Design a protein around this ligand. Structure first.
Ligand SMILES: O=C1CC[C@H](N2Cc3c(OCc4ccc(CN5CCOCC5)cc4)cccc3C2=O)C(=O)N1
Ligand SMILES: [Zn+2]
Lengths: 363, 1087
């Protein structure tokens, strides 16, 4: 591999001269907010997830332009709605080329919410009154039970033998409770994050968020799962339960299929790999403003390639895209990507669109 | 749901121990912290004199003594876990002791991340201020200006976000703090100075990359000054330009965790290992070097305190506390440690079970207690105890009588014992008992009564006759025989008045000098069974019980004419009858051969027996007997289940006596055994003192390894106990343990430190380890049950297990092993390999329910004697907890997610009924009933989910801050409100939960509030704050603090009257003090 893994996350295909905004707006826990709603966008946005957009209808063009002046956040509803996630605009681009109006933004999801009201304005744009959900944080399993003479030894110096000494040191006071160190380790953020980091290391070498919340929302976005589980993960407020649930998904779910036919194996977990710094999957907008969450894999099967390779609007610069569909039912599964220069590696790969996929556990 | 929580047994684990001059300046005190309790002793030569013990509405987290400028004696600073700060003073006002609160306030910050090294609290040696490291990036300071009664205080930002330990130093121009910290470079020590004047840190005297794993800090006193810093491998002194360092071989073994200063000088320190090593560290001199001696082995010390005279208090959390004696590096032997005294520490209670051990209808709790050598079973029994001073093997005793052989000594010197057709006399001189003759008393006849009588005489009443003997120059001075030489069948005598009875007839004699004169005669409608004639000089009546009409009766002074005549019912006869006086009233008691005891109020003038009540006390026949217990009379009911009978506010009480059967007893007041009892049974005479009130009594069984689960198999007359010893790799033991010291022994035939699991089999009566079965290499025993399955009559110990490898995070494999204990050994009756860890198991309607990772699985027991699956239930949680009631099943994970599954016999599988997911750490759960579920959850809380279409959500009906960490709940009760659930705890506190009717809940809730107005609270901490469910912080609900309620009885008579002022009460009307007294005393008798 020698492709610039940060080229994808900057979304150059939108144009690379966008006015940037120092991303920071965080509403108080359990507060209420009136935030506009992007029409025409159906996705379950995860905190931390970068969301690119292209907007045409002059009501959309207006209220974005307005948002640039005033707070920059908007609501991205998760549909049948009750729950959603805020998205802050961090880059703006006006464009009146070829005669016609376009606005291009790059938002980033920030905070989860509960919907309260949804008065849709006479301009045509919904305005959602919104309850900001708090992000449940619990202390260590040992914090309550801990011996006070053994408080002094809780911080350590920063290698599988290291994790045993960590487990022995951290959970020594498990002997006061009715369970072992190895059980308490299974609910330990740090142990759980490291275990997830090993499936992440084989997709591939980096630095990721220290925080259990942030980490958990980051890995949530890597998972090619259906819209209904995505919501199960989102509703889970505790980061520890989120990390365990993510470990489960990652171990159990191993094939991926055409959501429509229900029985045509497109690819496997073995093939998943990362060309984005974000991870193996990420949201990209197409020319018409349809967002696609596209999981990059090395090999795919039972896809037919129609049309001819094109570099036009390609989300991965250097690569050209060819449309791929399900051999059986014709469903647009994604795109085969192919190198334009003969020295690039990898030479080819498939980018498969999340909505068209369906993760399965075998037998 | 309406629950009542009460303490059965206060926490026993020590978590702080300080010395100083608290009670007087001239007294040396030892103060001890046991979570919410504060014990205060005075050190003596003889040992530790207890003085004042108090509770707090708080978990003691800091405890330091200090003496601010111009105070006669030391004041105590305490800070709780909820950030309740107080300054306390000891106040003796006359003959009463009180802990008054000089200052108090809550030192919490709204925004704050609590530090990873916990609360740290420190006072400078001038007593200008108190430092509190509560949160990262902050240092709270409370100045000790005497006007600061509200403990108003400022913060100072620290740069260093990861502080390990911290002290205040000695010998400085200004108050100066020294501390180890950690940044991404390494671990260093720094100092600042502290200006109250500026509310800011100035940079201070010195600094230093110290050892990777440095943890402790010690302020050296003023002869030198400076700071000692302990780690894993090193011990480092530090000062301005002076610096020493050592790394002796002797401590690189286990980490040092507690220290204490031996002399004000600072010459010597005591160091505390994590495994029991106790070291001295000597500062050799000026400051040349540091020597470190290894003194000996103690209980695993949480804290240490040198007391003077070479005595040391060892506070422990994992085993018993201790006083130990040190010796100087003596000419003949190296400095060594000796255990002087032991104090019980039940916790950690890791598991327990309730057993009716004595067969008496009286539960006994047996706990898995302690860790790592301090491991133990503890047998906790409720009752009145007997302090035994002498024992004598003499079988077949039928009666006891004390007697004064010398008429001008004020004290018993004789015990008389009757046997079948035979009388014996034991004389007493101090503690020397010798059988002897008593001239005038016959010895070839069975005595029915003897003792002192009026006009300087002794009387003996045999089956043959009524002999009467002179105190002086003993000889027979009188004898009374039955007209046709028939045997006296029943006897009863007092000061001046005999009433024998022959068959159906009964005569009535009186005692006058050198003559016993016959006064009455009479007949009786059936054969006579028992008599009493107790004065309440001479008694004007006589009680009887008879053989066929099965009836208790009163009679006249000489006539013998019926005065009340109550029928008692059934086919069994009376065995004893007793006219007695409790409180200031009069009663008649009467006992049946089947164990039943009936009592009646008595009228001495008329004879009217009133208000019959019944109670059943141990199915063998029951002899009743009067004794004195602190300027008042009780009754001792000798039976299967011996029992004392007192009267608390004009309603009688039946405190059971903590002994295997007593057949006869008498009081004994000798010079060597003053204010004592003589108890006899079938084989033994015992002499002892007796405790006034009931208490909990603790038998200890050391295992010298960690016990982990326990259950009782009644048929085998023994206990299953999962245990766990530590070996080190060769793999060899560190000490002999229960599992390596068993009679019989075994190891499972197959499919640096290491843990080795066993199933012990321990005798019910003797607690000998009979057998120790060792599980596989890498096998971790998790669950244990003792049950019968299917059509099989045999009873099995069943164990769930998991296979733990350090490579493997979630265990992929485990076993369900069925065992039979039949010979002295243990037979593996069946394995069952399973693709996961068996966290729990439970006997389920004659089948075996068992959690395996996320799966709940039901197994049936075949006639082929194998486990066969019926059904399964995959969950989205890990089934750590499993409890059932009938066909209902309760599942829980560690994160307070709970499910409610039901078995459906018609459908073959399990169905979900209800669920609740609410992220918090859960340590134990229990089924209160079909609808209600008790649980224990993070920051020492209890909580109750209730059951009651889209009503498969569980309503949260209960919340309460207990202040203890519950490991185990278990249904049972230690006495002979609805329901009883006992729980064991990490500090060895034991609690009981019961349920109330709404009416009672509402009353008692009102009364809590009335109580909280009236009762002084130590740190001036509000009871509501204390019991608030805390992590969120919400008021407690659906839980009555029974400890609070019970405290009503300890308040003064007017404070009661205040508490009940205009309180509506049912029967409503304006209630009295005595109305609530008898309610609260009804509530004490559930535990
Ligand atoms: O890596 C990838 C994988 C393929 C993916 N693409 C290309 C694409 C198209 O490609 C034709 C095309 C490309 C560009 C335009 C230009 N605009 C500007 C705005 O006004 C309308 C005209 C129009 C049509 C046409 C339709 C859909 C897609 C689509 O999903 C993608 O975007 N980047
Ligand atoms: Zn298809």
């Amino acid at each position: 591999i020698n492709f610039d893994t940060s080229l994808p996350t900057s979304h150059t295909y939108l144009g690379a001269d966008m006015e940037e905004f120092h991303g920071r707006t965080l509403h108080d826990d359990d507060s209420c907010q009136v935030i506009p709603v992007l029409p025409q966008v159906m996705m379950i946005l995860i905190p931390g997830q970068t969301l690119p957009l292209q907007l045409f209808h002059p009501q959309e063009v207006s209220m974005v332009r307005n948002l640039i002046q005033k707070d920059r956040t908007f609501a991205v509803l998760a549909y049948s709605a009750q729950f959603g996630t805020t998205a802050e605009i961090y880059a703006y681009r006006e464009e009146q080329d070829f005669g016609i109006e376009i606005v291009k933004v790059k938002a980033i999801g920030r905070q989860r919410f509960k919907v309260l009201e949804l008065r849709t304005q006479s301009d045509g744009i919904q305005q959602a009154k919104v309850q900001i959900l708090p992000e449940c944080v619990l202390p260590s399993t040992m914090s309550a039970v801990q011996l006070e003479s053994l408080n002094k030894c809780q911080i350590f110096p920063s290698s599988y033998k290291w994790w045993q000494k960590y487990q022995k040191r951290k959970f020594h006071c498990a002997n006061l409770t009715s369970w072992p160190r190895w059980l308490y380790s299974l609910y330990d953020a740090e142990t759980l994050m490291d275990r997830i980091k090993k499936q992440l290391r084989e997709w591939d070498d980096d630095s990721l968020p220290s925080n259990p919340i942030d980490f958990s929302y980051r890995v949530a976005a890597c998972l090619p799962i259906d819209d209904v589980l995505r919501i199960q993960l989102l509703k889970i407020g505790s980061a520890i339960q989120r990390l365990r649930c993510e470990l489960d998904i990652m171990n159990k779910c191993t094939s991926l299929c055409c959501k429509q036919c229900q029985e045509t194996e497109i690819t496997t977990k073995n093939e998943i790999f990362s060309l984005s710094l974000c991870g193996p999957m990420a949201a990209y907008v197409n020319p018409h403003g349809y967002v696609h969450e596209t999981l990059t894999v090395y090999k795919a099967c039972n896809l037919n390639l129609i049309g001819r390779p094109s570099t036009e609007h390609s989300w991965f610069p250097g690569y050209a895209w060819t449309v791929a569909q399900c051999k059986i039912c014709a469903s647009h599964i994604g795109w085969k990507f192919t190198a334009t220069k003969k020295d690039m590696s990898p030479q080819k790969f498939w980018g498969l669109t999340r909505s068209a996929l369906l993760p399965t556990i075998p037998d | 749901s309406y629950n009542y929580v009460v303490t059965a047994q206060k926490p026993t684990a020590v978590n702080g121990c300080v010395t100083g001059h608290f009670t007087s300046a001239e007294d040396l005190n030892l103060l001890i912290a046991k979570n919410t309790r504060l014990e205060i002793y005075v050190v003596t030569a003889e040992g530790l004199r207890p003085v004042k013990e108090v509770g707090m509405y708080g978990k003691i987290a800091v405890m330091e003594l200090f003496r601010p400028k111009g105070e006669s004696k030391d004041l105590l600073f305490i800070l709780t876990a909820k950030y309740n700060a107080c300054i306390l003073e000891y106040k003796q006002s006359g003959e009463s002791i009180d802990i008054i609160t000089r200052a108090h306030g809550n030192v919490q910050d709204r925004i704050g991340r609590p530090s990873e090294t916990g609360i740290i609290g420190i006072i400078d040696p001038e007593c200008r201020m108190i430092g509190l490291r509560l949160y990262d990036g902050l240092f709270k300071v409370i100045p000790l200006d005497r006007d600061n009664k509200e403990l108003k205080a400022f913060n100072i930002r620290l740069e260093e976000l990861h502080v390990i330990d911290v002290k205040f130093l000695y010998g400085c121009q200004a108050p100066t703090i020294c501390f180890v910290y950690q940044d991404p470079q390494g671990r260093h020590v720094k100092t600042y100075e502290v200006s109250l004047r500026e509310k800011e840190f100035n940079k201070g005297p010195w600094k230093q990359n110290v050892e990777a794993e440095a943890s402790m800090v010690i302020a050296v006193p003023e002869p030198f000054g400076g700071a000692i810093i302990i780690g894993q491998e090193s011990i480092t002194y530090h000062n301005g330009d002076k610096y020493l360092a050592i790394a002796p071989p002797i401590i690189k073994q286990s980490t040092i965790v507690c220290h204490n200063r031996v002399d004000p000088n600072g010459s010597r320190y005591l160091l505390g290992d994590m495994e029991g090593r106790l070291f001295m560290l000597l500062l050799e001199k000026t400051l040349k070097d540091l020597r470190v001696e290894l003194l000996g082995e103690t209980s695993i010390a949480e804290c240490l305190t040198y007391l003077d005279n070479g005595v040391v208090f060892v506070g422990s959390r994992l085993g018993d506390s201790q006083l130990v004696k040190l010796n100087v590096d003596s000419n003949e032997q190296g400095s060594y440690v000796v255990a002087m005294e032991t104090f019980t520490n039940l916790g950690p209670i890791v598991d327990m079970c309730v057993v009716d051990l004595e067969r008496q209808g009286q539960g006994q709790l047996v706990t898995c207690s302690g860790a790592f050598k301090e491991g133990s079973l503890r047998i906790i029994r409720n009752g009145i105890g007997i302090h035994e001073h002498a024992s004598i093997d003499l079988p077949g005793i039928k009666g006891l009588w004390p007697l004064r052989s010398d008429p001008n000594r004020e004290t018993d010197d004789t015990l008389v014992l009757s046997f079948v057709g035979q009388t014996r006399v034991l004389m007493l001189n101090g503690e020397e008992v010798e059988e002897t003759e008593l001239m005038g008393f016959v010895d070839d006849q069975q005595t029915f009564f003897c003792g002192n009588v009026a006009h300087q005489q002794l009387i003996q009443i045999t089956s043959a006759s009524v002999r009467l003997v002179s105190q002086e120059p003993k000889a027979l001075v009188s004898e009374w025989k039955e007209p046709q030489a028939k045997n006296i069948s029943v006897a009863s005598c007092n000061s001046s008045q005999v009433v024998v009875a022959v068959g159906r007839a009964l005569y009535y004699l009186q005692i006058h000098p050198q003559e016993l004169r016959q006064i009455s005669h009479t007949e009786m409608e059936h054969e006579v069974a028992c008599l009493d004639i107790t004065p309440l000089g001479l008694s004007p009546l006589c009680a009887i019980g008879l053989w066929t009409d099965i009836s208790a009766r009163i009679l006249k002074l000489p006539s013998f004419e019926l005065l009340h005549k109550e029928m008692l019912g059934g086919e069994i006869i009376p065995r004893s009858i007793l006219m007695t006086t409790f409180e200031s009233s009069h009663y008649l008691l009467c006992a049946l051969g089947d164990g039943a005891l009936f009592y009646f109020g008595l009228n001495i003038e008329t004879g009217l027996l009133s208000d019959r009540k019944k109670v059943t006390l141990g199915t063998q026949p029951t002899v009743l007997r009067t004794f004195r217990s602190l300027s008042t009379t009780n009754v001792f009911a000798c039976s299967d289940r011996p029992t004392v009978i007192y009267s608390s506010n004009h309603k009688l009480v039946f405190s059971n006596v903590n002994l295997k059967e007593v057949n006869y007893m008498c009081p004994l007041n000798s010079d060597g055994y003053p204010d004592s009892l003589a108890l006899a049974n079938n084989s033994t005479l015992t002499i002892g003192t007796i405790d006034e009130i009931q208490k909990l009594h603790i038998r200890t069984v050391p295992l010298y390894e960690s016990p982990r689960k326990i259950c009782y198999q009644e048929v085998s007359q023994c206990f299953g106990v999962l245990s766990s010893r530590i070996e080190v790799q060769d793999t060899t033991a560190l000490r002999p343990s229960a599992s390596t010291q068993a009679l019989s022994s075994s190891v499972s035939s197959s499919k640096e430190e290491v843990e080795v699991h066993n199933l012990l089999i321990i005798d019910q009566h003797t607690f000998e380890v009979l057998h120790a079965h060792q599980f596989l290499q890498n096998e971790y025993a998790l669950s244990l049950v003792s049950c019968k399955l299917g059509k099989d009559p045999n009873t099995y110990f069943i164990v769930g297990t998991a296979m733990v490898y350090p490579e493997e995070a979630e265990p992929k494999q485990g076993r369900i092993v069925v065992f039979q204990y039949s010979d002295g050994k243990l037979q593996t009756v069946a394995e069952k390999e399973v693709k996961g860890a068996v966290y729990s198991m439970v006997e389920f309607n004659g089948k075996l329910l068992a959690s395996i990772n996320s799966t709940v699985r039901l197994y049936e027991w075949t006639t082929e004697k194998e486990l066969r699956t019926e059904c399964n239930h995959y969950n989205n949680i890990m089934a750590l907890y499993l409890k059932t009631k009938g066909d209902f099943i309760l599942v829980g994970d560690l994160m307070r997610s709970v499910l409610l599954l039901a078995y459906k016999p018609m459908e073959g599988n399990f169905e979900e009924i209800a669920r609740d997911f609410n992220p918090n750490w859960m340590s134990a759960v229990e089924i209160l009933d079909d609808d209600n579920f008790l649980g224990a959850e993070n920051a020492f809380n209890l909580f109750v989910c209730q059951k009651d279409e889209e009503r498969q959500h569980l309503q949260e009906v209960g919340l309460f801050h207990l202040g203890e960490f519950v490991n185990v709940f278990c249904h049972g009760s230690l006495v002979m409100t609805q329901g009883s659930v006992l729980f064991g705890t990490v500090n060895g506190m034991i609690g009981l939960v019961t349920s109330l009717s709404e009416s009672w809940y509402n009353l008692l809730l009102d009364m809590q509030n009335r109580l909280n107005k009236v009762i002084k609270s130590v740190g001036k901490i509000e009871h509501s704050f204390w019991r608030s469910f805390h992590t969120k912080t919400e008021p407690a609900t659906g839980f009555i603090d029974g400890d609070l309620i019970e405290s009503f009885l300890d308040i003064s008579r007017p404070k009661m009257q205040e508490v009940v002022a205009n309180l509506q009460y049912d029967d409503k009307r304006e209630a009295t003090a005595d109305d609530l007294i008898k309610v609260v005393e009804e509530l004490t008798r559930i535990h």
